[PDB]
Write a protein that binds this ligand. Structure first.
Ligand SMILES: C[S@@+](CC[C@H](N)C(=O)[O-])C[C@H]1O[C@@H](n2cnc3c(N)ncnc32)[C@H](O)[C@@H]1O
Ligand SMILES: C[S@@+](CC[C@H](N)C(=O)[O-])C[C@H]1O[C@@H](n2cnc3c(N)ncnc32)[C@H](O)[C@@H]1O
Ligand SMILES: [Mg+2]
Ligand SMILES: [Mg+2]
Ligand SMILES: [Mg+2]
Ligand SMILES: [Mg+2]
Lengths: 211, 211
């Protein structure tokens, strides 16, 4: 074995997801701007059968009205009292957005914990990716026309996952500029949350041959 | 290519999921008996990015109080007005259970449509599996100690997926008896809904090399 372990980190850009705590739990998809999708991504990033993945960090950058961008960071090793269902996760996200509302613009420059393992910050998608590059991460863009993941060595990863409409031409230009490596998990276009499930499975299996 | 296509069919045994329409949407996991899990399984069985999988049939057999068993059958090619979020699916399941409540015991011997593509019937797990065997299906049991799916030819499949506690010693005996083939998708124990995602991905990829 190589005995190499690394954090699995994901960034999901939520193009339209609501950025105030004024959340209608009864319309997560419509009035909340596909908040349901974001909740499933959180669920799929962390939850196993009788456990939570302690090596995962998940970042969501929300661009919906009225206060974008808001970045919410979930740290698997620290999360308490989150369960895999959308309603529970949505309430945790509501709490995070409420915390963000209580902070001034200076305070929002930093990560601010709302509940254990959940932090909010004024941070956009590109600045977040830059910050990860400076830490030494490799950026991988999960995109259906990328290299077959089967053949790529993955090291110190940050996985980028777009939503229903996607990252957009602007941010693709940017990923191209910083040399993000595109990887494919499937011949079909999947929901963002399915990508994370596939990506975890790829890494779980490599762990068996290689580490 | 072989030009071979087949229906992808799944059976999920929901050990504790509620069997009346008296459903608390605000406690899908607790008072509904892990109804949230069943909803995610439905979601993951059917939904792609800009589509629904028309070659899938999903069966759920619910064993929770007060009227078990209830079998709900979802037919991908027929579903209308279902979206991927748990709340929407839970309401469709509520409707199905309401339909079941309105039928007498004789009427429950047959499939009874509640909403397009959704049918309810008094049918237990074993009788359902028997019925599928008699139709010519091969039964595959997704179980973490099974053969690596990579190496198994899959033909005319019905995939069995247990829940959080699992199929149970009784029904395992039965699957052993009828010679169900056990297949593994992962070195880790996953949520039932993740199995379906992995299983779809395996089939989508084979479709590319072989069909
Ligand atoms: S799609 C709707 C949502 C997101 O999931 C990712 N995705 C979808 N299908 C994929 C595939 N087949 N391979 C890799 N990533 C994919 C992309 O990042 C996309 O923007
Ligand atoms: S577990 C909790 C839920 C169900 O998903 C299936 N499952 C979980 N992990 C699996 C794995 N690694 N390979 C194949 N099936 C699995 C089993 O059927 C199990 O009963
Ligand atoms: Mg690792
Ligand atoms: Mg950071
Ligand atoms: Mg097929
Ligand atoms: Mg039938």
């Amino acid at each position: 074995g190589s005995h190499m372990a690394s954090m699995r980190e994901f960034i999901f850009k939520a193009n339209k997801t609501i950025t105030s705590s004024d959340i209608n739990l009864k319309d997560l998809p419509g009035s909340c701007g596909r908040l349901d999708l974001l909740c499933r991504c959180v669920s799929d990033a962390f939850f196993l059968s009788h456990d939570i993945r302690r090596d995962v960090v998940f970042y969501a950058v929300l661009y919906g009205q009225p206060n974008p961008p808001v970045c919410i960071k979930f740290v698997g090793s620290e999360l308490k009292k989150v369960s895999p269902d959308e309603r529970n996760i949505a309430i945790f996200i509501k709490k995070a957005l409420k915390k963000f509302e209580e902070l001034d613009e200076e305070q929002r420059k930093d990560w601010n914990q709302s509940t254990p393992g959940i932090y909010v910050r004024r941070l956009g998608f590109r600045n977040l990716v830059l910050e990860k590059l400076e830490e030494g991460k490799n950026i991988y863009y999960l995109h259906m026309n990328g290299e077959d993941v089967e053949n790529v060595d993955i090291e110190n990863p940050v996985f980028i996952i777009g939503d229903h409409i996607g990252i957009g031409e602007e941010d693709e230009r940017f990923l191209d500029e910083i040399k993000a490596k595109r990887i494919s998990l499937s011949p079909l276009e999947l929901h963002a949350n399915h990508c994370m499930t596939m990506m975890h499975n790829v890494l779980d299996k490599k762990r068996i041959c290689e580490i």
